[PDB]
């Protein structure tokens, strides 16, 4: 919650997809259709600086990319993640072309 400690060993965290509502309440006017919240409103458990870009895998599928937030692990400030399920077409098309 405070300070800085960047690990040598990979870290893991289980966290649930928050409903649109609880996500939008947390960040009024800032959550687009390409975003989902995943984590805990009590704070304590969250992704942070250096995690960005990494995976949020649910039932064997990449559903999120670590994107942004208001700090890390704060009460009522869950992580916000790129909603990967909106981009399968773009990803495939790009891979085909390149």
């Amino acid at each position: 919650s405070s300070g800085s400690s960047y690990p040598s060993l990979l870290q893991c965290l289980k966290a649930p997809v928050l409903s649109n509502s609880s996500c939008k309440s947390s960040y009024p006017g800032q959550i687009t259709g390409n975003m989902i919240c995943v984590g805990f409103l009590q704070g304590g458990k969250d992704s942070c600086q250096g995690d960005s870009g990494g995976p949020v895998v649910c039932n064997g599928q990449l559903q999120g990319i670590v994107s942004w937030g208001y700090g890390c692990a704060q009460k009522n400030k869950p992580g916000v993640y790129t909603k990967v399920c909106n981009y399968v077409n773009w990803i495939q098309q790009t891979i085909a072309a390149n």
Partner: protein
């Protein structure tokens, strides 16, 4: 990751570290030569 645990070694085989002199961002391996990450991690 705040409030997590240390993953079992080499569990999460799809996880990658993006490095420019040092680790700066993560990413995921989605086929043998494409990694997906965050646009704000651009370097």
């Amino acid at each position: 990751i705040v409030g997590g645990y240390t993953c079992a070694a080499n569990s999460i085989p799809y996880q990658v570290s993006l490095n420019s002199g040092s680790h700066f961002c993560g990413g995921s391996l989605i086929n043998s030569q494409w990694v997906v990450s965050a646009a704000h991690c651009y370097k």
